[PDB]
């Protein structure tokens, strides 16, 4: 899974 915020959530 993920914890941090993905760069540019637009993608």
């Amino acid at each position: 899974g993920v914890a941090f915020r993905a760069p540019s959530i637009h993608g």
Side-chain angles (χ1 to χ4, degrees):
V2 298
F4 66 89
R5 302 296 186 85
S8 54
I9 58 166
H10 303 261

mmCIF file of all heavy atoms in Angstrom:
data_model
loop_
_atom_site.group_PDB
_atom_site.id
_atom_site.type_symbol
_atom_site.label_atom_id
_atom_site.label_comp_id
_atom_site.label_asym_id
_atom_site.label_seq_id
_atom_site.Cartn_x
_atom_site.Cartn_y
_atom_site.Cartn_z
ATOM 1 N N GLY A 1 0.861 -1.218 0.000
ATOM 2 C CA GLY A 1 0.000 0.000 0.000
ATOM 3 C C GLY A 1 0.880 1.245 0.000
ATOM 4 O O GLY A 1 2.081 1.164 -0.271
ATOM 5 N N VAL A 2 0.271 2.392 0.305
ATOM 6 C CA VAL A 2 0.999 3.664 0.342
ATOM 7 C C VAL A 2 0.696 4.421 1.635
ATOM 8 O O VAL A 2 -0.326 4.178 2.282
ATOM 9 C CB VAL A 2 0.632 4.535 -0.876
ATOM 10 C CG1 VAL A 2 1.047 3.817 -2.162
ATOM 11 C CG2 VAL A 2 -0.881 4.799 -0.915
ATOM 12 N N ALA A 3 1.593 5.341 1.995
ATOM 13 C CA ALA A 3 1.428 6.146 3.205
ATOM 14 C C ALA A 3 1.525 7.623 2.863
ATOM 15 O O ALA A 3 0.644 8.411 3.217
ATOM 16 C CB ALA A 3 2.509 5.792 4.223
ATOM 17 N N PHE A 4 2.597 7.981 2.154
ATOM 18 C CA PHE A 4 2.808 9.361 1.740
ATOM 19 C C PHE A 4 1.860 9.686 0.589
ATOM 20 O O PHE A 4 1.229 8.781 0.033
ATOM 21 C CB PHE A 4 4.277 9.576 1.315
ATOM 22 C CG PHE A 4 4.597 8.774 0.067
ATOM 23 C CD1 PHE A 4 4.392 9.350 -1.192
ATOM 24 C CD2 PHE A 4 5.088 7.468 0.167
ATOM 25 C CE1 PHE A 4 4.674 8.622 -2.351
ATOM 26 C CE2 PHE A 4 5.374 6.738 -0.996
ATOM 27 C CZ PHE A 4 5.166 7.317 -2.255
ATOM 28 N N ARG A 5 1.773 10.964 0.229
ATOM 29 C CA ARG A 5 0.903 11.368 -0.869
ATOM 30 C C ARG A 5 1.669 11.287 -2.185
ATOM 31 O O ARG A 5 2.783 11.806 -2.296
ATOM 32 C CB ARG A 5 0.372 12.794 -0.647
ATOM 33 C CG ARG A 5 -0.401 12.893 0.686
ATOM 34 C CD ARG A 5 -1.662 12.013 0.656
ATOM 35 N NE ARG A 5 -2.457 12.222 1.874
ATOM 36 C CZ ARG A 5 -3.358 13.216 1.995
ATOM 37 N NH1 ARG A 5 -3.581 14.069 1.020
ATOM 38 N NH2 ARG A 5 -4.029 13.333 3.109
ATOM 39 N N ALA A 6 1.065 10.619 -3.168
ATOM 40 C CA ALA A 6 1.693 10.448 -4.477
ATOM 41 C C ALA A 6 1.931 11.807 -5.150
ATOM 42 O O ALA A 6 1.017 12.637 -5.156
ATOM 43 C CB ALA A 6 0.793 9.607 -5.383
ATOM 44 N N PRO A 7 3.104 12.062 -5.743
ATOM 45 C CA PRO A 7 3.355 13.362 -6.437
ATOM 46 C C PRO A 7 2.268 13.609 -7.475
ATOM 47 O O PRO A 7 1.915 12.699 -8.230
ATOM 48 C CB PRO A 7 4.721 13.167 -7.103
ATOM 49 C CG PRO A 7 5.402 12.133 -6.275
ATOM 50 C CD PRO A 7 4.300 11.182 -5.819
ATOM 51 N N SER A 8 1.723 14.827 -7.491
ATOM 52 C CA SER A 8 0.649 15.177 -8.423
ATOM 53 C C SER A 8 -0.437 14.093 -8.433
ATOM 54 O O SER A 8 -0.388 13.151 -9.230
ATOM 55 C CB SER A 8 1.209 15.371 -9.835
ATOM 56 O OG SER A 8 1.939 14.215 -10.220
ATOM 57 N N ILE A 9 -1.412 14.240 -7.533
ATOM 58 C CA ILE A 9 -2.522 13.278 -7.423
ATOM 59 C C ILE A 9 -3.428 13.291 -8.669
ATOM 60 O O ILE A 9 -4.359 12.487 -8.768
ATOM 61 C CB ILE A 9 -3.373 13.590 -6.175
ATOM 62 C CG1 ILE A 9 -3.922 15.030 -6.258
ATOM 63 C CG2 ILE A 9 -2.508 13.435 -4.919
ATOM 64 C CD1 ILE A 9 -5.032 15.233 -5.223
ATOM 65 N N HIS A 10 -3.161 14.214 -9.595
ATOM 66 C CA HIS A 10 -3.960 14.349 -10.817
ATOM 67 C C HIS A 10 -3.886 13.065 -11.633
ATOM 68 O O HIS A 10 -4.892 12.606 -12.183
ATOM 69 C CB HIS A 10 -3.411 15.500 -11.670
ATOM 70 C CG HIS A 10 -3.410 16.774 -10.871
ATOM 71 N ND1 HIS A 10 -4.404 17.734 -10.975
ATOM 72 C CD2 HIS A 10 -2.537 17.233 -9.922
ATOM 73 C CE1 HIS A 10 -4.103 18.717 -10.105
ATOM 74 N NE2 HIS A 10 -2.974 18.460 -9.439
ATOM 75 N N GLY A 11 -2.681 12.498 -11.703
ATOM 76 C CA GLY A 11 -2.452 11.269 -12.450
ATOM 77 C C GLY A 11 -3.390 10.161 -11.986
ATOM 78 O O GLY A 11 -3.866 9.421 -12.832
#
